[PDB]
From a paper:
Tryptophan repressor ([name]) was one of the earliest gene-regulatory proteins for which a high-resolution crystal structure was determined in complex with its DNA regulatory site. The [name] dimer is formed from deeply intertwined monomers and is related to domain-swapped proteins, even though it does not meet a proposed definition predicated on the existence of a stably folded monomeric structure, which [name] apparently does not have. Formation of the extended domain-swapped structure depends on the conversion of two interhelical turns in each subunit of native dimeric [name] into helical segments, resulting in the formation of a continuous, nearly straight α-helix of 47 residues. [name] crystals in the typical native dimeric form have previously been reported for a variant in which Val58 is replaced by isoleucine ([name]), one of 19 [name] mutants created by Arvidson et al. to explore the role of the identity of the residue at position 58, which forms part of the l-Trp-binding site.
Numbering used by the authors:
A (entry chain A), B (entry chain A): 1 to 105
The structure:
């Protein structure tokens, strides 16, 4: 039920091997301190700049998404911590509660 | 005499640091076996295929340029080796040369 032509299946295998040979070539380049000249040969100046900005875009997305979780958690905890104090205050004995009211001036 | 605006000089430094941060990020990704997913995040499918084909293009250029040097060298050596044999044959003594002609039947 695969339903794929031998031509398309051979091209997909070709692109897969060509991609795997590049990442392996780049890996050995880092191990030989040749990554910088290889990237200058493999990439255009506009593609190198695009990659540099995309890292910053990922950084701003992660920082933006994490900062929205922190305000979501701090606002929720600020409400959850009030309810914990309310329940604990209801459970306190009268001798403590009435003494707190006398220090409630 | 540099004659460059502070705006352009700051942007060139920004692109340089962004590019250096990417290659450093990719280096640590190879050391952490995270290169394959990082490249899938940083590159589009069309850009990954372009890089895979460019490696093959470099391979065919190097193989093509080297094969042209080998035929250039083999044709030149084939001429240089005939002249060496001609000179060495002129320098040979008569007793050898005349004996070679008697085995020249
Ligand atoms: N004894 C309280 C302590 C506490 C938690 N959150 C609070 C907020 C206000 C006052 C007290 C608390 C408790 O177990 O939950
Ligand atoms: N004695 C010859 C050997 C040699 C080199 N090339 C040759 C070609 C043909 C015959 C002999 C040779 C030399 O020193 O050069």
């Amino acid at each position: 039920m695969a339903q794929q032509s031998p031509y398309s299946a051979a091209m997909a295998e070709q692109r897969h091997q060509e991609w795997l040979r590049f990442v392996d070539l780049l890996k050995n380049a880092y191990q030989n301190d040749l990554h910088l000249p290889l990237l200058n040969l493999m990439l255009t100046p506009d593609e190198r700049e695009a990659l540099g900005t995309r890292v910053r875009i990922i950084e701003e997305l992660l920082r933006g998404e994490m900062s929205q979780r922190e305000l979501k958690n701090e606002l929720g905890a600020g409400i959850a911590t009030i309810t914990r104090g309310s329940n604990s205050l209801k459970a306190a004995p009268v001798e403590l509660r009435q003494w707190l009211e006398e220090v409630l001036l």
